[PDB]
Design an enzyme around this catalytic site. Structure first.
Site, PDB file in Angstrom:
ATOM      1  N   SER A   1      -2.814  -1.021  -3.022  1.00 34.06           N
ATOM      2  CA  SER A   1      -3.794  -0.025  -2.613  1.00 34.06           C
ATOM      3  C   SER A   1      -3.086   1.315  -2.430  1.00 34.06           C
ATOM      4  O   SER A   1      -1.858   1.389  -2.419  1.00 34.06           O
ATOM      5  CB  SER A   1      -4.525  -0.535  -1.379  1.00 34.06           C
ATOM      6  OG  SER A   1      -5.624   0.269  -0.984  1.00 34.06           O
TER       7      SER A   1
ATOM      8  N   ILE B   1       0.823  -1.210   0.000  1.00 30.56           N
ATOM      9  CA  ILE B   1       0.000   0.000   0.000  1.00 30.56           C
ATOM     10  C   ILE B   1       0.859   1.263   0.000  1.00 30.56           C
ATOM     11  O   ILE B   1       1.987   1.294   0.510  1.00 30.56           O
ATOM     12  CB  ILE B   1      -1.045  -0.068   1.164  1.00 30.56           C
ATOM     13  CG1 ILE B   1      -2.009   1.120   1.195  1.00 30.56           C
ATOM     14  CG2 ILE B   1      -0.379  -0.269   2.520  1.00 30.56           C
ATOM     15  CD1 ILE B   1      -3.223   0.902   2.092  1.00 30.56           C
ATOM     16  N   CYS B   2       0.312   2.311  -0.637  1.00 32.80           N
ATOM     17  CA  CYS B   2       0.819   3.689  -0.605  1.00 32.80           C
ATOM     18  C   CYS B   2       2.163   3.770  -1.331  1.00 32.80           C
ATOM     19  O   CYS B   2       2.179   3.569  -2.549  1.00 32.80           O
ATOM     20  CB  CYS B   2       0.724   4.300   0.795  1.00 32.80           C
ATOM     21  SG  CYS B   2       0.507   6.077   0.720  1.00 32.80           S
ATOM     22  N   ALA B   3       3.276   4.052  -0.653  1.00 32.01           N
ATOM     23  CA  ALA B   3       4.566   4.097  -1.328  1.00 32.01           C
ATOM     24  C   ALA B   3       5.170   2.722  -1.559  1.00 32.01           C
ATOM     25  O   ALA B   3       6.134   2.621  -2.315  1.00 32.01           O
ATOM     26  CB  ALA B   3       5.571   4.911  -0.519  1.00 32.01           C
TER      27      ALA B   3
END
Ligand SMILES: [Cl-]
Ligand SMILES: [Cl-]
Ligand SMILES: [Mg+2]
Ligand SMILES: [Mg+2]
Lengths: 195, 195
Positions: free
Chosen positions: B154, B104-106
Site C-alpha cells: 500500500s 506500506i509506503c517506503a
C-alpha cells in the site's frame, strides 16, 4: 512557530490522536502531548491497546501558550477528560483567551456538552452518539469549524486526516494544509485545500 | 484466532503503524508489536516524534505463529528494517512458509526490492519512490494484493485504512472487514467491502 497541546488519557482513540499529531508536525506546528487523568503518569494505554508516552502531565503544561487544545475521542478517554476538572478548566481558558478548541468522535458529546462550554455552538461528533449533542447544535459532517467560537469538531477515526488538515489551515494557512495533504495519498472525498 | 506481527523501528511512520494496529484489533486479530531497534529498545520514537511502546523485541517473537508480518513505512524505519538481518530473515520465512507479507509506503522499495524477496509479483508503495520499484512490478493503486506470492502493499499514510481493512479481509474475511469499516466514518474513496 504555531503550537498545539494534544491531550491523552487512558482509553483515548489512538488513530485519532496519532494521525492528528503526525499531520500537525508535518504542518510545522510544535506539538506537546499531555497526560490527563493519570496523576502524572506518562504511559497511556489507548482504546485498542496501543501504548504511547506523553511528553508531560497536563498540570505542568496547561498554562502554556499553545494555539489549539486537541481532545481525541475514545469512549473512556473522553470520560476521563470530562471528569477532570483541570482538563475542563483548561479548555474553557483556551476559549476565553481567544484560542482554538478541537475535539473528535466522542469528545464533543462527552466533554463539551455536559459542561456547557459552547452552549449555542455548532458541532459534530461520532454519528451514533448524535443523540448526546443538542439537536439545534448538531451537524452530521466530517468536520465542523464554528469560526464564531473557534470550535473545531470532527466525527471519528476515519475523519482524523480531515480534522488535522483543518487545524493546519487555521494555524499556518491553506498552502501548508495543501502541502501536507499532498504527502499523504488521501482518499477521494477528502478535501485537499488546493482550492 | 488470526494474528499479526507488526514491526516497529526508530523512524517508523506512526499513522501507518497505529492505524493498522487499531483496525486489526477491531477485526478481532491478535496483534503483537515487535521492535526492530538494533539494541532491542522497545520505546520507539516514530518519524514525527510520537513515542510508541513495542510489546517485544523481534528476536523474542519472530518465530511465533502469526498469519501476517506487517512492515510500516517511514523513511528511516524502513532503512532500519532493510539493515536488520533478523527482520529480513523473518520476512523471508513468512513468505517461504506460505504466510502473508504486508508492507506500506517506503517499506516495499526500501526493504523488499533490494533483498529481492519478491522477484515476481505486483507491488505498490509511496509514489515518489515509484522509480525504486521495478517497472514490470509497479502498480499505482491504493492497495495491491498479489495472491500468487501473498504480498500485500500500500502507498502511504492516507492509505493506512485501506491497508488495514485488506489485512482483515485476508485473515478474517469480507464480513469482518465491512463491520470494521462501518465503525470508522471513513471517506467515500475507500472500499467498504459491501456489495
Ligand atoms: Cl496531570
Ligand atoms: Cl456558544
Ligand atoms: Mg442547551
Ligand atoms: Mg527483478
Amino acid at each position: 512557530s504555531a503550537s498545539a497541546l494534544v491531550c491523552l488519557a487512558p482509553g483515548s482513540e489512538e488513530t485519532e490522536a496519532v494521525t492528528t499529531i503526525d499531520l500537525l508536525v508535518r504542518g510545522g506546528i510544535k506539538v506537546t502531548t499531555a497526560s490527563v487523568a493519570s496523576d502524572g503518569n506518562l504511559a497511556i494505554t489507548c482504546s485498542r491497546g496501543v501504548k504511547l508516552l506523553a511528553d508531560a502531565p497536563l498540570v505542568e503544561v496547561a498554562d502554556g501558550e499553545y494555539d489549539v487544545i486537541v481532545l481525541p475521542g475514545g469512549i473512556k478517554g473522553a470520560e476521563c477528560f470530562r471528569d477532570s476538572t483541570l482538563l475542563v478548566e483548561t479548555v474553557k481558558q483556551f476559549h476565553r483567551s481567544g484560542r482554538i478548541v478541537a475535539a473528535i468522535c466522542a469528545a464533543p458529546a462527552t466533554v463539551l456538552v455536559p459542561h456547557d462550554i459552547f452552549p449555542i455552538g455548532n458541532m459534530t461528533g461520532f454519528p451514533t452518539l448524535k443523540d448526546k449533542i443538542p439537536a439545534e447544535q448538531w451537524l452530521d459532517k466530517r468536520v465542523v469549524w464554528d469560526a464564531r467560537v473557534k470550535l473545531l469538531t470532527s466525527q471519528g477515526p476515519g475523519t482524523a486526516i480531515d480534522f488535522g488538515l483543518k487545524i493546519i489551515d487555521l494555524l499556518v494557512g491553506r498552502e501548508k494544509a495543501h502541502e501536507v495533504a499532498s504527502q499523504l495519498v488521501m482518499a477521494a472525498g477528502i478535501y485537499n485545500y488546493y482550492e
